[PDB]
């Protein structure tokens, strides 16, 4: 009899329930990470899936390996399963897909077929503030990329440049860091002078000077409160009543307020000039429907368009400082480089002068090859994706991970990818270019395929708008580091690794290097 067997099924339910509380929180960890085991076995029999890497503890997943060395874990991976791969991380699903195939299936993504924000929403609104970025259908975030990017002109650049020099040259006056008037040689962090350098240099010539003139005051507090604030932590406690959380939230208001109280004061007294990022999104910050951003949503847009910019730039000086520290021969080559181009200094560095220094901006351009900021960009899967010459399908509600960084790092496209070697970019110092055919997502012609091996700033209709001033701003920087000062590592030191688990693929500190005046008796003016 069948039926004597589910009197059983209601016994054997009956006596589980009776078991000791030792028994049962034991089998409510062993029955999942059983049954887990078991998902995975069958999962790997379905062929309209790519390979599955195997993990142990139910939903943590690989995210242990993929969060402390993504790029060893990304080749492991290749080595086992191709360039097509899924893993579970932290609950979801990540799809990789490897090479320049894989910068085409993500980057240029359907629009219907994925979505950045819904990746990255949770990463960037509690930073940021509302109604801009990923708080905000694509069709508005393609329109804020617009309203700034047209405040990033080339004559935009020809201004910032000066302004950008004077804020380095008062850094090496003022900061306890240097002092050059004072000292000759000493010993800096550079994850303490770049983040300051950064920020210095980039509020100056966004911002304006109001606002640069904020940071000199206890107001330096609350953007280092915000900074703290932008952490992939965010991706899975984005708001927890701990205190970290608040000072996050408050600094967000009071540094919004800021910005809302100087944009409010330009409008009533119509002191609405060309002069900074801030003047312009005034301007130009109506959508094609009608629509005005508030007060504060430009405010918001500001405070994302500083704060990617601080972390991406500011890890990439950190590099280059990093990797020539341990080169002389480059820091001699790039010097040479500098006396040709300006006359033995004596022409004053502009943009134009800029565009003339192809050493430099390959030096730029390779330490972004050896150290993209972003290893991983996510999109969302939103419905299935059949891959191309496979019988693979993602099924929406999985995400996809692409990483033009690990690519950066391969022999087959980078002859020595391991090597520093700023001559791979002879005859090509240009930040990037459009290998042909040009599209227009809403904020201006991009190159069409993102097929390039070479992906620093993405492709695609999330990509960056800020390399040239990226460029502008590490060009000035490195610009006048190498006519001011020599520097090499401490004993027996050499080049971090880097720091995955960060928001940008920053070194690990402290990384120190030495540095003295190529002139010992060189003064800079102006007062302090
Ligand atoms: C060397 C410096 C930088 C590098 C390597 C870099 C890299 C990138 C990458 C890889 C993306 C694509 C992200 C994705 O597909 O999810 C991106 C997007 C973006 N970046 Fe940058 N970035 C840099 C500096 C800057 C600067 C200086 C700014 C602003 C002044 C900026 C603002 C933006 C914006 C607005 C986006 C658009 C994201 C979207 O539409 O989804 N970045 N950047
Ligand atoms: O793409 C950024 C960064 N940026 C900065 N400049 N250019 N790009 C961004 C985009 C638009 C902005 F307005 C401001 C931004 F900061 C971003 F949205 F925040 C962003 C997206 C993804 C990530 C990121 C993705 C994956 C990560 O994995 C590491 C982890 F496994 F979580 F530990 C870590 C970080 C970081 N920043």
Same mark, same amino acid.
């Given at each position: 009899?069948?039926?004597?067997?589910?009197?059983?099924?209601?016994?054997?339910?009956?006596?589980?329930?009776?078991?000791?509380?030792?028994?049962?929180?034991?089998?409510?960890?062993?029955?999942?990470?059983?049954?887990?085991?078991?998902?995975?076995?069958?999962?790997?029999?379905?062929?309209?899936?790519?390979?599955?890497?195997?993990?142990?503890?139910?939903?943590?997943?690989?995210?242990?390996?993929?969060?402390?060395?993504?790029?060893?874990?990304?080749?492991?991976?290749?080595?086992?399963?191709?360039?097509?791969?899924?893993?579970?991380?932290?609950?979801?699903?990540?799809?990789?897909?490897?090479?320049?195939?894989?910068?085409?299936?993500?980057?240029?993504?359907?629009?219907?077929?994925?979505?950045?924000?819904?990746?990255?929403?949770?990463?960037?609104?509690?930073?940021?503030?509302?109604?801009?970025?990923?708080?905000?259908?694509?069709?508005?975030?393609?329109?804020?990329?617009?309203?700034?990017?047209?405040?990033?002109?080339?004559?935009?650049?020809?201004?910032?440049?000066?302004?950008?020099?004077?804020?380095?040259?008062?850094?090496?006056?003022?900061?306890?860091?240097?002092?050059?008037?004072?000292?000759?040689?000493?010993?800096?962090?550079?994850?303490?002078?770049?983040?300051?350098?950064?920020?210095?240099?980039?509020?100056?010539?966004? $911002?304006? /000077? +109001?606002? &640069?003139?904020?940071? %000199?005051?206890?107001?330096?507090? @609350?953007?280092?409160? *915000?900074? #703290?604030?932008?952490?992939?932590?965010?991706?899975?406690?984005?708001?927890?009543?701990?205190?970290?959380?608040?000072?996050?939230?408050?600094?967000?208001?009071?540094?919004?307020?800021?910005?809302?109280? $100087?944009? /409010? +004061?330009? &409008?009533?007294?119509? %002191?609405?000039?060309?002069?900074? @990022?801030?003047?312009? *999104?005034? #301007?130009?910050?109506?959508?094609?429907?009608?629509?005005?951003?508030?007060?504060?949503?430009?405010?918001?847009?500001?405070?994302?368009?500083?704060?990617?910019?601080?972390?991406?730039?500011?890890?990439?000086?950190?590099?280059?400082?990093?990797?020539?520290?341990?080169?002389?021969?480059?820091?001699?080559?790039?010097?040479?480089?500098?006396?040709?181009?300006?006359?033995?200094?004596?022409?004053?560095?502009?943009?134009?002068?800029?565009?003339?220094?192809?050493?430099?901006?390959?030096?730029?351009?390779?330490?972004?090859?050896?150290?993209?900021?972003?290893?991983?960009?996510?999109?969302?899967?939103?419905?299935?994706?059949?891959?191309?010459?496979?019988?693979?399908?993602?099924?929406?509600?999985?995400?996809?991970?692409?990483?033009?960084?690990?690519?950066?790092?391969?022999?087959?496209?980078?002859?020595?990818?391991?090597?520093?070697?700023?001559?791979?970019?002879?005859?090509?110092?240009?930040?990037?270019?459009?290998?042909?055919?040009?599209?227009?997502?809403?904020?201006?012609?991009?190159?069409?395929?993102?097929?390039?091996?070479?992906?620093?700033?993405?492709?695609?209709?999330?990509?960056?708008?800020?390399?040239?001033?990226?460029?502008?701003?590490?060009?000035?920087?490195?610009?006048?580091?190498?006519?001011?000062?020599?520097?090499?590592?401490?004993?027996?030191?050499?080049?971090?690794?880097?720091?995955?688990?960060?928001?940008?693929?920053?070194?690990?500190?402290?990384?120190?290097?030495?540095?003295?005046?190529?002139?010992?008796?060189?003064?800079?003016?102006?007062?302090?």
């Amino acid at each position: 009899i069948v039926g004597e067997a589910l009197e059983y099924v209601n016994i054997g339910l009956s006596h589980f329930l009776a078991l000791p509380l030792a028994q049962r929180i034991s089998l409510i960890i062993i029955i999942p990470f059983i049954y887990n085991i078991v998902w995975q076995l069958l999962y790997s029999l379905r062929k309209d899936r790519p390979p599955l890497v195997f993990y142990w503890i139910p939903w943590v997943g690989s995210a242990v390996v993929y969060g402390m060395k993504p790029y060893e874990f990304f080749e492991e991976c290749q080595k086992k399963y191709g360039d097509i791969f899924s893993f579970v991380l932290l609950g979801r699903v990540m799809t990789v897909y490897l090479g320049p195939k894989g910068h085409e299936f993500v980057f240029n993504a359907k629009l219907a077929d994925v979505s950045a924000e819904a990746a990255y929403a949770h990463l960037t609104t509690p930073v940021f503030g509302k109604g801009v970025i990923y708080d905000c259908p694509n069709s508005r975030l393609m329109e804020q990329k617009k309203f700034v990017k047209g405040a990033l002109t080339k004559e935009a650049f020809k201004s910032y440049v000066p302004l950008i020099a004077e804020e380095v040259y008062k850094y090496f006056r003022d900061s306890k860091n240097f002092r050059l008037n004072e000292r000759t040689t000493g010993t800096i962090d550079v994850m303490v002078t770049q983040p300051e350098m950064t920020i210095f240099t980039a509020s100056r010539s966004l $911002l304006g /000077k +109001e606002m &640069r003139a904020k940071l %000199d005051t206890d107001f330096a507090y @609350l953007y280092s409160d *915000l900074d #703290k604030g932008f952490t992939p932590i965010n991706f899975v406690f984005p708001n927890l009543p701990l205190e970290h959380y608040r000072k996050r939230d408050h600094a967000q208001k009071a540094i919004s307020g800021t910005y809302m109280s $100087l944009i /409010k +004061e330009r &409008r009533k007294n119509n %002191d609405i000039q060309d002069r900074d @990022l801030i003047d312009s *999104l005034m #301007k130009n910050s109506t959508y094609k429907d009608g629509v005005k951003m508030t007060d504060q949503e430009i405010a918001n847009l500001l405070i994302g368009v500083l704060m990617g910019g601080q972390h991406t730039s500011a890890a990439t000086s950190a590099w280059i400082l990093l990797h020539l520290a341990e080169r002389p021969d480059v820091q001699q080559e790039l010097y040479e480089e500098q006396m040709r181009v300006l006359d033995g200094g004596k022409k004053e560095l502009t943009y134009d002068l800029l565009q003339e220094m192809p050493l430099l901006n390959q030096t730029i351009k390779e330490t972004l090859r050896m150290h993209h900021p972003l290893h991983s960009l996510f999109r969302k899967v939103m419905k299935d994706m059949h891959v191309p010459n496979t019988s693979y399908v993602i099924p929406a509600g999985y995400h996809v991970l692409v990483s033009p960084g690990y690519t950066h790092l391969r022999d087959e496209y980078f002859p020595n990818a391991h090597q520093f070697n700023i001559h791979r970019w002879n005859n090509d110092s240009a930040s990037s270019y459009s290998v042909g055919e040009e599209v227009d997502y809403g904020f201006g012609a991009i190159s069409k395929g993102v097929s390039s091996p070479y992906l620093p700033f993405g492709g695609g209709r999330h990509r960056c708008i800020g390399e040239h001033f990226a460029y502008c701003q590490l060009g000035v920087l490195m610009s006048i580091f190498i006519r001011t000062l020599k520097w090499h590592y401490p004993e027996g030191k050499t080049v971090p690794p880097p720091d995955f688990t960060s928001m940008v693929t920053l070194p690990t500190g402290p990384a120190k290097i030495i540095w003295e005046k190529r002139n010992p008796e060189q003064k800079i003016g102006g007062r302090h």
